[PDB]
Amino acid sequence: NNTATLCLGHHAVANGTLVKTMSDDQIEVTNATELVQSISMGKICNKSYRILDGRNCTLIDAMLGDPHCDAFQYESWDLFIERSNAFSNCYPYDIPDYASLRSIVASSGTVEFTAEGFTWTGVTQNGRSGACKRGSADSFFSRLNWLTKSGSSYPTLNVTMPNNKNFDKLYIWGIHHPSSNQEQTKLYIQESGRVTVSTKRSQQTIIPNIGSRPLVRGQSGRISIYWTIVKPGDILMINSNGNLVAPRGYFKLNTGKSSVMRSDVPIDICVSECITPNGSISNDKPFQNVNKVTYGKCPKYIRQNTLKLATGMRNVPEK
Amino acid sequence: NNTATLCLGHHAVANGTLVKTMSDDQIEVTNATELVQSISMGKICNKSYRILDGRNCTLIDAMLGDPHCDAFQYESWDLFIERSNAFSNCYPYDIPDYASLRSIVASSGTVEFTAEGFTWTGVTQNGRSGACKRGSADSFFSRLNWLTKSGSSYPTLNVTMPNNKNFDKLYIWGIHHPSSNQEQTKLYIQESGRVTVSTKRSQQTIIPNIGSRPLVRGQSGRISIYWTIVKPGDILMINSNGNLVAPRGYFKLNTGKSSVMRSDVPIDICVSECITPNGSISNDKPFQNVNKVTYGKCPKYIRQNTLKLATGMRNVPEK
Amino acid sequence: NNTATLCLGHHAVANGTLVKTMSDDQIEVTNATELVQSISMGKICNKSYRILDGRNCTLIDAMLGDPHCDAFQYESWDLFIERSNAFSNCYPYDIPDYASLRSIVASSGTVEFTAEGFTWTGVTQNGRSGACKRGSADSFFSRLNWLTKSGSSYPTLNVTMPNNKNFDKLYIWGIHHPSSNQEQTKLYIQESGRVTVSTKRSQQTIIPNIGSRPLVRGQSGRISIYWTIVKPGDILMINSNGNLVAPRGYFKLNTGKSSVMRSDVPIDICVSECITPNGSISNDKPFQNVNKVTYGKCPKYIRQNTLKLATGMRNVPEK
Amino acid sequence: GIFGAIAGFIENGWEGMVDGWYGFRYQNSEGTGQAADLKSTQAAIDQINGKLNRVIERTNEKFHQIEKEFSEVEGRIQDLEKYVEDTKIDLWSYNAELLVALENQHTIDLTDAEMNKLFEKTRRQLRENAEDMGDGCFKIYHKCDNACIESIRTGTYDHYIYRDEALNNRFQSGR
Amino acid sequence: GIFGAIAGFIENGWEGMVDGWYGFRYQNSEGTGQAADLKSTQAAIDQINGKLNRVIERTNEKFHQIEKEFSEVEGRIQDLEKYVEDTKIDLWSYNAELLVALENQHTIDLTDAEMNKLFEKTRRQLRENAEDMGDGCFKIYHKCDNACIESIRTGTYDHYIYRDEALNNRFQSGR
Amino acid sequence: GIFGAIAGFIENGWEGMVDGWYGFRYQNSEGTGQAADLKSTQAAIDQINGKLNRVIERTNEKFHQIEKEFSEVEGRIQDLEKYVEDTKIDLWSYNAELLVALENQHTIDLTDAEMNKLFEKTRRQLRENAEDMGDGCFKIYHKCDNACIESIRTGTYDHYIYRDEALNNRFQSGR
C-alpha cells in the first residue's frame, strides 16, 4: 500500500503446562519445573559416603562383639545400615537407655577397640556360655570379660585405670543377673553382688537383681550393660565384690559426622549425596517427598508430592 | 450537545473497613474477613468425636479400678476429659513416669480389661484395705491383685503367661511398700521382698523400699506401679518372693487417634470438629487464638487475636 | 524559542549500594539498611537486667553453700553468669539429674534460704570434712546437715515438717556413700543405711551404695543429692536408719523470669536489653548472628551475617 | 496503587453502583446513564475468591500430641516441651502476619490493575475520536446515543464510521 | 496479568516464533516478515533463571539427627520426638506452597510487563506517525520498507523525517 | 522495573536533585530550572518508612529456655535438644532471606510506579498541547514561562487557554 503495519507479540508452544499463582488456581505457562523429588533410586549408592552394611548385625551387637559379628570389628563408617532380619546370637542382655548408647556409638562412627591391661587378682576370667558359640565352642562377647570366683574366693575387686590419652575414653561394662540364689553363691562367693564404677566426676553403683527369666538360647540368666565416659586426666575405678562383667578396654569417641539408619534396601555401585531408607535420592531439587528420615546433602521433606514452578510466560494459543 | 462524555469508575460502600498491606499500616477497603477464630463456643460439643467425661475420675484411676470409678470400665473414647475436682479414693500410690503411662493409655483410647487365669500357689489373694471401700466394705483396685502369705509361707513365686493373640498386651502390676519391718515380715515371711517381671526382650526388678510415709486414708503404706509391654509370641514371667501386687490380665494397646484433655467446661448437645480446654470452636478460619491445646480438625494457634484479610478494592468515598 | 520542554525525573546518589530482589541477584539502590546484628559489645552490660557474676562459683555450689561461695547466699538475680574457671571446693558429690536441678534454681532466680527447726534425736549433727575447710577448720555445705551416730545408737529417724506458707517449698537433701563396710558401721550403727523422703503425692527411697571411689580432696567417700517439692498443705516426712545428709530448711520457688548463662566475658558499666555469651548486643535490628544462646529482648538468631534491606529506589547514575 | 487509577486519576468510587465493581457513566443525546462492566468485575472477584486456599491447604486432623500446661516443676524435659511449643507458635504467628500483608497488597494492586485495564481497553476503541480528560472520562467528539455507547461497552464500536464527524468537531478550531 | 498485554490487548501468542520470547511481525512495501526482540527476551530470562536461588540457599549437609520411626511405645519422650518432627515438616510444607505461589505470580506479571514495555517503547518511537490499532499493532502512516522497520526495531527511527509524509496520509480526510 | 520508567524511558537519575526523590527540569522563555515533586516523593517514603514493622512485630522478651551447648555426650535427650534448636534457626533463616527479597522487590516496583504515575499525571494535564519525546520529556507547543510551568507542577494548568496557540505551532507543517 502506502502505509505499513507493525505488530507486536510474544511466543507460544504446543506443549503448555499448568501451574498455580496467587491469582489463579490453574494457569497454563510455556514451561515449568518440578521442585519436589518424588522418585527414589531404589538402592543405596555405595560411593559418595562411606556406607557399612550391618547385615545380620545391629550396631550395638557389632560393638559388644557377638561372635557372628566379628567381621565388623576394625570397621568405621559414615553411615551404618541396620537390617530388619538382624539377630542377636550371644548371652541374653539388656541396656538401660539402649537408644542413647546406640546414638552415641553411631555418631562416633567406629567400633574400633583399644585393649587395656586390667589386673583382676583373686578371680578367674573369660567366663563363657552356650548362648554365643564362637564356632562350636562356648564363648562370650569379645569386648567383655566375665569374672567368676577362684578356689572359694571372690575378693573385693578394686582396679584403677587412668586416662592420659587426651581424648574421652568410652568404657563398656556390665553386671550379671543369675537365675537362682544357689547360682549367685556358686559363681561368686557372696550372697549379693555389687558393681561400683566411678570417676571423679561421676559414680554409679549397680546391685544385681536375681531370679528366673524366660529361656533364650538355653539360658534364664541375663546381663545388663552400662557405659562410662572418662575425660582426659580423670581416671576409671571399678569396685566390686560380685557379678562384675568387666571391660577389656575403651572405645574412642569422635566428634564425627557419622550416623546409623534402618533400611532393607540393597547397596549398589551408583553415586549420590543424599540417603533415605528407601534408597539414595537426587540433590538437584529443593524439596522431596520420599522420606522424613535422611542423611547427607538432602532436599527438605514436605507432605506434597508435586510442586510446579513456572519458568516461562503464560501460554496463550489461538484456536 | 453534539458530543458525548463517557466516564469510567468503580464502586464504593458506606461501611468501609481497615486492613494492612505491605505499603500501608492502615487502608480502607470495601470488605474484609476475620482469619482468626477468637470466640469459643463455651461448651464441649458432645457429638462429632466420642467424648468421655471423667467426672471425679482421672484416666489413670479409671483404668486401675479405684472403686468410685467402676462406671468407666468397659469405656472407650476419642477424647477423655479430666476435671480439676477429680480425686483418688483408694490405696495411696505412685507411678514412676506417671505422665508417660497416662499418655500411652490415652492413645489406646480404652480401659477395657481382659482377665487372665494366673495361678498363685502358696499365697493368699485379693488383699484389701480401708483406703478404698467399695460400698462400706474394704477393697482394693479392681484391676490389681494383692498377694500376702498363707500359713507362714510365701514361696518364691514363678508364673509364666504367653501372648499368642497377635497384638501387644499391656500388663499393669506393682509392688507394696510396707511401713515397718514388723509389717514386712508379718505380710510376707521374708525380711525383704523382690519383684522381677520379665520377658525375652526386657526385664525389670524392683526391691520394695520400707518405712513410714504420711497418712492418707488411714494408711502410711504405699504401692508403686509399673507396666510391661509384651509383644506377640513373647511371654510374661513374674518372679517374686515378697510384696508382689499382681496383675489380673491385660489391656489391649491400639494404634488409635485417641487422646486425653484437661478441662472444666461442660459437655453439651452441639456439633463441632475441634476441641480446646475452653470448649469446642469453629473450623471455618485458618488461625485461632483460643488455646494452644487442641484436639481434632483445628485451626492453627497464633498469638494475635485479629487478622483482617481484604476481600475487595480500596474504598474511596467522596465527601 | 516559541515552545518549551518539560522533563521528568528522579534522583541519584554518589554512594549507591547493592541489594537482592526477586528479580535480580544484585542491584544498586540509593540506600539500604543492615537487618542483621553482627557486632557484639564485647562486655555484658551491668544495668538493664540484674546480673550476678558467679566468679569461682557454679549456681549449684552457691546454693548448697560450698564455703568459698558464702558470698552468694542472700543473692537473687535476673541472670546468673557461670564462668569456666569455677571450681567445687567441698565434699565430693553427684546429683542425679544435675541439669534439671540447675534449671529449676536458675528460674527461681534466688538461692535465699529459710532455716527450719528439724529435731534429730538419737544422733549427732553438723558432721564435717577436710574436703571443705571453712577457713582452716573442717566444715561441710552450709545448707546441709550431716548426721552420724551418737553413743552406739542411730535410731530409725522419723521427722515430719508441714508446709503452711501457701507456696512450694524446695527441700535439698542427700545420702552418704561411705568407702568401706568398716566405715558404714563406724558412722551409722546399721550395716546398710536407707533414706525415705516422702510426702502424700510423691515418695522416694535411696539405698546408699558403698565402696572406694577416687580421691578428691583427700576423700574416697561421696554424697548424692536429691530434692523434693512440697505443695501447700502437704507435708515433708523423712525416714532413715542410716546415712542421711539432712536438710536445714527450704528454698522458695518463684515463677520468675530468671535464668543462668555460661560466659567468660567481663561485666561492665554500659546499658543493654539483650545478652549473649559473647556480651550484650543491640536491640534495634530484627535478626542477629552473634549467638543462638540469648536472654532478654533479643533479635532472632539466623545463620547469615548480613542482610541488606533497600530503603530507596534504584540508583541509576549517568557516566 | 501502582497503577494510580483507584484513588488516583479516578478521584473516587461510586456508591450508587450496585450492578458491579467497575463500570461506566455517560451523558449523551438521550440523557445520562450508568452500566457495570461484568468482565472486569468478574476478573477481580475470581482472583479474590478462595485466594487463601491457594496457600493454606484444607485444614487437617490432629489428635494426641504433647502436654502444654504443667502441674509441677520438672526441669529439663519440661523446659524442652515448652520451648518446642513456644517456637512453633511464634513461627506460625510470623507466617500469618506475613501472609495477610502479601495477600492484601496483592488484592489492592490487582483491583487497581482491573480499573486501569478497563480504562485503557476503552481508550483503544475510541482511537482518534476521543480525548482523555484526566477524570477517567472521555470527551467523544461525535454524537453518540445509547446504542453507540453500548457498542463501546460491548467492544463493537467502529471508529472509522465516526472519524470524519469527529475530525470536523475536533478541528472546528485552530486560533 | 496486571498489564493486560499477554492474554489481553495482544489476543494470543506466536507458535511460529522460535527466535525469542517477544518480537515483531510486519507487513510493508517489501512483503511480510518477523523478528524477535533480544533485550526484552533476555530481560525476562535473566529474572526467571536462578529465581529460586535468591531465596533458598544452596542445600546443606546434615548428618546424625533424631530417630523418627519407633519399634515400641514409650510415651512422653517419643510423643515429643514425633511432635518436633511433625511440626517441622508442616512448617516447611507451608513454606514450599507459599514460595511456589509467590514466584509464579511474580513470573507472570514480570513477563506481562516485558510485553507491555516493548509495546510502549515502540509506540514512543513512532510518535505522531502511527496509530495504536488495539491488536498490539501499529498503523504507520508512511511507506516503511524493511530498513525503515529495522530502524524501529533497533531504536534508531527518526520520526521528523517521515512527519510530513505521515501528515498527508493521516489528514487525507476530514468529512 | 515493571513500569520501565526508572532505568527505562527515563535514561538516568539526577544527582543534583537534593530537594526530593522525583521532580521536573524545564527550559522555557525565562531560562532553565528544576523543582522536586513533594507528593510523589512523600508517597514513596511513607511506604518505605517502617516497611518491616508491618510484618515483624516489635521484638519480644524471652528469658530462661533450653541449654544449647553441652559438656558431655548424653545421647537421646541431647540429640533432641540440638535438633529442636537447629530446626528453629534454619526456619528463621529461610524467613529472613525470603522477607528481604519480597520487600526489596516491592520497594523497587513501588518507586518505579511513583515515577510512572507522575509522568502519566503530567501528560494528562498537557492534553493535546504537548508531545511525549521518549526521554520522559514533553515538547510543549506553546510559550510557557515559569508561572505556566508552576501551574503544571501544582495541577492547575488549563489546556483550553493554550489550545489555539499550540495548534498553530503544531500544524505549522504538513508536507
Ligand SMILES: *[C@@H]1O[C@H](CO)[C@@H](O[C@@H]2O[C@H](CO)[C@@H](O[C@@H]3O[C@H](CO[C@H]4O[C@H](CO)[C@@H](O)[C@H](O)[C@@H]4O)[C@@H](O)[C@H](O[C@H]4O[C@H](CO)[C@@H](O)[C@H](O)[C@@H]4O)[C@@H]3O)[C@H](O)[C@H]2NC(C)=O)[C@H](O)[C@H]1NC(C)=O
Ligand atoms: C519358672 O517357670 C518356668 C515355666 O515355664 C520355668 O522355665 C521353663 O523350664 C522348662 C524346664 O527346663 C523349660 O523347658 C525346657 O525346654 C527346652 C527347650 O525348649 C524349647 O525348645 C525345645 C526344642 O529344642 C522344645 O522341646 C520346647 O517345646 C521349647 O520350644 C528343652 O530342651 C528342655 O528339655 C530337656 O531337658 C529336660 C529337663 O527339664 C529333660 O527332661 C529332657 O531330657 C530334655 O532334653 C526343657 O524341657 C522351659 O522352656 C522353660 N520356660 C521358659 C519360658 O523359660 C522355670 O524353670 C521356672 N523356675 C523355677 C521352677 O524355679
Ligand SMILES: *[C@@H]1O[C@H](CO)[C@@H](O[C@@H]2O[C@H](CO)[C@@H](O[C@@H]3O[C@H](CO[C@H]4O[C@H](CO)[C@@H](O)[C@H](O)[C@@H]4O)[C@@H](O)[C@H](O[C@H]4O[C@H](CO)[C@@H](O)[C@H](O)[C@@H]4O)[C@@H]3O)[C@H](O)[C@H]2NC(C)=O)[C@H](O)[C@H]1NC(C)=O
Ligand atoms: C513418724 O512420724 C509421724 C508423726 O506425725 C507419725 O505419723 C502420725 O501418727 C499419728 C498417730 O497415729 C497420727 O495421728 C492419727 O490421726 C488420725 C486421723 O487424723 C487426722 O484426722 C483426724 C480426724 O478424723 C484428726 O483427729 C487429726 O487431727 C488429723 O487431721 C486419728 O484418727 C488417730 O487418732 C486415733 O488413734 C489414736 C492412736 O494414736 C487414739 O489415741 C485415738 O483413740 C484416736 O481414735 C491418730 O491420732 C498422725 O496423723 C500421723 N501423721 C502423719 C503425717 O501421718 C508416724 O506414726 C511416725 N512413725 C513412727 C513413730 O514410727
Ligand SMILES: *[C@@H]1O[C@H](CO)[C@@H](O[C@@H]2O[C@H](CO)[C@@H](O[C@@H]3O[C@H](CO[C@H]4O[C@H](CO)[C@@H](O)[C@H](O)[C@@H]4O)[C@@H](O)[C@H](O[C@H]4O[C@H](CO)[C@@H](O)[C@H](O)[C@@H]4O)[C@@H]3O)[C@H](O)[C@H]2NC(C)=O)[C@H](O)[C@H]1NC(C)=O
Ligand atoms: C583402691 O585402689 C586405689 C589405687 O589407686 C586406692 O586409692 C589410692 O590410695 C593411695 C593410698 O592412700 C592414694 O595415695 C595417697 O595419695 C595422697 C595424695 O596424692 C596425691 O597428691 C600427693 C601430693 O600432695 C602426691 O604425693 C600423689 O602423687 C598424688 O598426686 C598422699 O598424700 C598419700 O600419701 C600419704 O599417706 C601415705 C599412706 O598411704 C603415707 O605412706 C605417707 O606418709 C603420705 O603422707 C597417699 O599415698 C592414692 O591417691 C589413691 N588413688 C586414688 C585414685 O584415689 C584405694 O585405696 C584402693 N582401695 C582399697 C585397697 O581398698
Ligand SMILES: *[C@H]1O[C@H](CO)[C@@H](O[C@@H]2O[C@H](CO)[C@@H](O[C@@H]3O[C@H](CO)[C@@H](O)[C@H](O[C@H]4O[C@H](CO)[C@@H](O)[C@H](O[C@@H]5O[C@H](CO)[C@@H](O)[C@H](O)[C@@H]5O)[C@@H]4O)[C@@H]3O)[C@H](O)[C@H]2NC(C)=O)[C@H](O)[C@H]1NC(C)=O
Ligand atoms: C524448560 O523446562 C526446563 C526447566 O526450566 C528446562 O530444562 C532445564 O534447564 C536448565 C537451565 O537452563 C538446564 O540446566 C543444565 O543442566 C545440565 C545437567 O543435566 C547441565 O549439563 C547444563 O550445564 C551446562 O550449561 C551451559 C549452557 O547454559 C553449558 O554451556 C555448560 O557446558 C560447558 O560450557 C563450556 C563453554 O565454555 C564448555 O567449554 C564446556 O564443555 C562446559 O561443559 C554447562 O555444563 C545446564 O546447567 C537443564 O537442561 C534442565 N534442568 C533440569 C533439571 O531438567 C528446559 O530447557 C526448558 N525447555 C524449553 C523448551 O525451554
Ligand SMILES: *[C@H]1O[C@H](CO)[C@@H](O[C@@H]2O[C@H](CO)[C@@H](O[C@@H]3O[C@H](CO)[C@@H](O)[C@H](O[C@H]4O[C@H](CO)[C@@H](O)[C@H](O[C@@H]5O[C@H](CO)[C@@H](O)[C@H](O)[C@@H]5O)[C@@H]4O)[C@@H]3O)[C@H](O)[C@H]2NC(C)=O)[C@H](O)[C@H]1NC(C)=O
Ligand atoms: C464480604 O464480606 C464477607 C467476606 O468475603 C462475605 O461473606 C462471606 O462470603 C462467602 C463467600 O461468598 C459466603 O460463603 C457462603 O457460606 C455459607 C455458609 O454460612 C454457605 O451457605 C454458602 O454456600 C452456598 O453458596 C452458593 C452461592 O455462592 C449457593 O448457591 C450454594 O447453595 C446451593 O446451590 C444449589 C444450586 O444448584 C442449590 O440447588 C442448593 O440449594 C445448594 O444448597 C451453597 O450452598 C457460601 O459458601 C458467606 O456468606 C460469607 N462467609 C463468612 C464466613 O461469613 C460477604 O458476602 C461480603 N459482603 C459483601 C457486601 O460483599
Ligand SMILES: *[C@H]1O[C@H](CO)[C@@H](O[C@@H]2O[C@H](CO)[C@@H](O[C@@H]3O[C@H](CO)[C@@H](O)[C@H](O[C@H]4O[C@H](CO)[C@@H](O)[C@H](O[C@@H]5O[C@H](CO)[C@@H](O)[C@H](O)[C@@H]5O)[C@@H]4O)[C@@H]3O)[C@H](O)[C@H]2NC(C)=O)[C@H](O)[C@H]1NC(C)=O
Ligand atoms: C538511609 O540509610 C539509613 C536507613 O534508612 C538512614 O538512617 C536511619 O534512618 C532512620 C529513620 O529515618 C533514623 O532514625 C532515627 O534514629 C535516631 C536514633 O539513633 C533517633 O534519634 C531519631 O528519632 C528522632 O526522629 C525525629 C525525626 O524524624 C525527631 O524529630 C525526633 O526528635 C524529637 O522531635 C521533637 C519535635 O517536636 C523534639 O521536640 C524533641 O527534641 C524530640 O527528641 C526523634 O527523636 C530517628 O528515629 C536514623 O537516623 C537511621 N537509623 C539507623 C539504625 O541508622 C539514613 O538516614 C538514610 N540516608 C539517606 C542519605 O537518606
Ligand SMILES: CC(=O)N[C@@H]1[C@@H](O)[C@H](O[C@@H]2O[C@H](CO)[C@H](O)[C@H](O[C@]3(C(=O)O)C[C@H](O)[C@@H](NC(C)=O)[C@H]([C@H](O)[C@H](O)CO)O3)[C@H]2O)[C@@H](COS(=O)(=O)O)O[C@H]1O
Ligand atoms: C539338671 C541336670 O539334669 N543336669 C545338670 C545340668 O543342668 C548342668 O547344665 C548347666 O546348667 C546351668 C544352670 O544351672 C547353666 O545353664 C549351664 O550353662 C552355662 C551357660 O552356658 O551359660 C555354662 C557356663 O559354663 C556358665 N558360665 C560361667 C559360670 O561363666 C554359665 C553361667 O553359670 C550361667 O549362664 C549364669 O546364669 O552357665 C549348664 O551347662 C550341668 C553342667 O554343670 S554346671 O551346672 O554347669 O556346673 O550339670 C548337670 O548335672
Ligand SMILES: CC(=O)N[C@@H]1[C@@H](O)[C@H](O[C@@H]2O[C@H](CO)[C@H](O)[C@H](O[C@]3(C(=O)O)C[C@H](O)[C@@H](NC(C)=O)[C@H]([C@H](O)[C@H](O)CO)O3)[C@H]2O)[C@@H](COS(=O)(=O)O)O[C@H]1O
Ligand atoms: C494399735 C491399736 O491400738 N490397735 C490395733 C490396730 O492398729 C490394728 O489396725 C490395723 O493397723 C495396721 C497397721 O499396723 C493396718 O493399717 C490395718 O489396716 C489395713 C488396711 O486397711 O490397709 C487392714 C488390711 O486388712 C491390710 N491388708 C492386707 C494385709 O492385705 C492392710 C495392710 O496390711 C497395710 O495397708 C500394709 O501397709 O492394713 C489396720 O486395720 C488392728 C487390726 O489388726 S491387724 O493389725 O490388721 O492384724 O489391731 C489392733 O490391735
Ligand SMILES: CC(=O)N[C@@H]1[C@@H](O)[C@H](O[C@@H]2O[C@H](CO)[C@H](O)[C@H](O[C@]3(C(=O)O)C[C@H](O)[C@@H](NC(C)=O)[C@H]([C@H](O)[C@H](O)CO)O3)[C@H]2O)[C@@H](COS(=O)(=O)O)O[C@H]1O
Ligand atoms: C591410716 C593412718 O595411718 N592413720 C589414721 C588416719 O587415716 C585417720 O584419718 C581419717 O581417715 C578417714 C578414712 O578412714 C577419713 O578420711 C578421715 O577424714 C574425714 C574427712 O575429713 O572427711 C574426717 C571427718 O571427721 C569425718 N566426718 C564425719 C564422720 O562426719 C569424715 C567421714 O567419716 C568420711 O568422709 C566418710 O566418707 O572423714 C581421716 O581423718 C585418723 C583420724 O581418725 S578417724 O579415722 O577419723 O576416726 O586416724 C589415724 O589413725
Ligand SMILES: *[C@@H]1O[C@H](CO)[C@@H](O)[C@H](O)[C@H]1NC(C)=O
Ligand atoms: C515441550 O517439548 C520440548 C521439546 O521436546 C521440551 O524441551 C520441553 O521441556 C517440553 N515442555 C514441557 C515438558 O513443559
Ligand SMILES: *[C@@H]1O[C@H](CO)[C@@H](O)[C@H](O)[C@H]1NC(C)=O
Ligand atoms: C456492610 O453491610 C452489608 C449489608 O448489611 C454487609 O453484608 C457487609 O458485610 C458489611 N460490610 C462489612 C462488615 O465490612
Ligand SMILES: *[C@@H]1O[C@H](CO)[C@@H](O)[C@H](O)[C@H]1NC(C)=O
Ligand atoms: C551516603 O552518604 C551519606 C552522607 O554522608 C550518608 O548519610 C548515607 O547513609 C550514605 N549511603 C549509604 C551508606 O548507602
